[PDB]
Structures are given as structure tokens and as C-alpha cells.
Amino acid sequence: DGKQYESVLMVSIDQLLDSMKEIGSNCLNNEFNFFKRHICDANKEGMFLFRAARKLRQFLKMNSTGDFDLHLLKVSEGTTILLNQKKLNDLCFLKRLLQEIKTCWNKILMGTKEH
């Protein structure tokens, strides 16, 4: 079902990252604790995407009507369907979050043509 990701889910992750390619080169990059505590480690990738998807919702504003929020919703409600708090505003963390989500999806993919 990784075909689902590549063809539908990934379209949204990429669109989101595109609206954030201007940001980045300016925030204290010092990895956040989220990534220190949660890694998409070999055969434990599922646990990561799940959490990552959940963390994502925390960036949803009330008026969840806008290409941006819709893409966020699609990525996580979507990642969730393929497997089984406080509000945030830092786009640096979201940007890094999306990047790690893509990377994790890649391992799960270039890892089934294995088993």
C-alpha cells in the first residue's frame, strides 16, 4: 500500500514543504526533543509515523479551511489510515517534522522490497 503514499499522501507532504522552502535557514536548528526521543529506527518506523502524524494535528487552527490546513489534515489522517494537546506555531518544527515523515516513509518503502 506504499503506492497510496507515493501517489496520494506524498502529494500533500510535498506541497506543504513547498510553502515552507523560504523558511528554515534562521531558527536555532538544535534538534528539538521530539526527535531526540523519537526516531524512525529500523523496524520501529510505524511507531514514529504514528506519533509524527499525531504531532501534526497540533498545527491545525480552528478554522480548518484552507489549502494549508487541508494538506496537514490529509497527511496525518492519511498516514493514520494506512497503519492502524497544546497548539504549536513554530514552522521550523513543522518543516522538520514533515521532512522526517517523508524519510520514514521511504524506509518503510525501500524496506518491503526486502522482507
Partner: protein
């Protein structure tokens, strides 16, 4: 009885998608009937279609495009019938356009080319095109050609001399998505030289 069929169109208006349904019996009484879709949506749980004469249709960006949805023909609030469709398998491409035949004097062949707005789309960007053509004198006997690119070449050697041909194209989803043939492109008419 109340049977119906639908086709979705992704990124048909910008990044907005559209789902369109209609009863198969064109004479069915639709002045009390309602169409609704639930599941595989995002901000909301279900969506209410909009009747536009005999057909019902939705235009949104709220389709998840992962998993089946439940379209129902409601009568007031009674679910007369429902089907579970996966909006990614009933896609109908937009019709190709800017068809254009060009005769190359030297190579004694015609180079047919066309365009499809699907190229710059993000989802349904892989299509299987069907180029169809026939000769005026002939009827209902078209020569089809399946292409995957937007350029096709016919040889004069294979086309009747001094004749008027009618040619047209249409596309169908071909990679991850599934669906139906798009409407035909407008026809183009060209004449083959006198051999």
C-alpha cells in the same frame, strides 16, 4: 431502480476536485431525491451534493483520496441505496485539446500532436491516450491508436491518397488511478495529398 454511477475529477478547478453522480435510468423522478457522500473526507464527515437539473455534483478539496467512501441516494432521510466507491478509481480525465496534424514534406508523414492539462497536475499525471481517426467516405470504422505521449506519427504510405480524414483523441487514467475515458477532443480535419 435507483441505481447510479459517478466519476470524480481531481484538480479540475485549480487544486479543487469534483465528484459527479447521476441515476442510470434517465427518467427517474428526482424532485425528492438527495445525494450524499460520507467517509474518506477531512475537515467534515459527510458532504451534500448539489442538484443541477438531472445530475448531482460536489466541488471540494476535502477528499482524502485514501480508502472508500459511501455515496447514498437519500429520500428525505431514508437511505434508498448506497455504494462504497474509492474516488481514486472512478477518475475521468479532462479531454485533451489543441489537437494538430502537421504534414512533413520530406518524410512523407503526418505528425499528430495534442495537449493535456493533466501534465501539470499533481495526482492524475499519467494517462493512456487513445487517438482515433477515419476517412470521410468511411463510417463507424475508426482506426485507433493507444499512446502514452502527446505525439503520434502517421505515414502517408499507410493513409489513403487524396482523402479527408477526421482525427480525435481522449484520455484515461493509467498509473495509480483508475477511471473512465475522457470526453473526445474536438475533431481535426486534414487532407492527404494526391499520390
Amino acid at each position: 431502480d435507483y441505481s447510479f454511477s459517478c466519476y470524480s475529477q481531481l484538480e479540475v478547478n485549480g487544486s479543487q476536485h469534483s465528484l459527479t453522480c447521476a441515476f442510470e435510468d434517465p427518467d427517474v423522478n428526482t424532485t425528492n431525491l438527495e445525494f450524499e457522500i460520507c467517509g474518506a473526507l477531512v475537515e467534515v464527515k459527510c458532504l451534500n451534493f448539489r442538484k443541477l437539473q438531472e445530475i448531482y455534483f460536489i466541488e471540494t478539496k476535502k477528499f482524502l483520496l485514501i480508502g472508500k467512501s459511501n455515496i447514498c441516494v437519500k429520500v428525505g432521510e431514508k437511505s434508498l441505496t448506497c455504494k462504497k466507491i474509492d474516488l481514486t478509481t472512478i477518475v475521468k480525465p479532462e479531454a485533451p485539446f489543441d489537437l494538430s496534424v502537421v504534414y512533413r514534406e520530406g518524410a512523407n508523414d503526418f505528425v499528430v500532436t495534442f495537449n493535456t492539462s493533466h501534465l501539470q497536475k499533481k495526482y492524475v499525471k499519467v494517462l493512456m491516450h487513445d487517438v482515433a481517426y477515419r476517412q470521410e467516405k468511411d463510417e463507424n470504422k475508426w482506426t485507433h491508436v493507444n499512446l502514452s505521449s502527446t505525439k503520434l506519427t502517421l505515414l502517408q504510405r499507410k493513409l489513403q491518397p487524396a482523402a479527408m480524414y477526421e482525427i480525435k483523441v481522449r484520455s484515461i487514467p493509467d498509473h495509480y488511478f483508475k477511471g473512465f475515458w475522457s470526453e473526445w477532443s474536438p475533431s481535426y480535419y486534414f487532407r492527404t495529398p494526391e499520390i
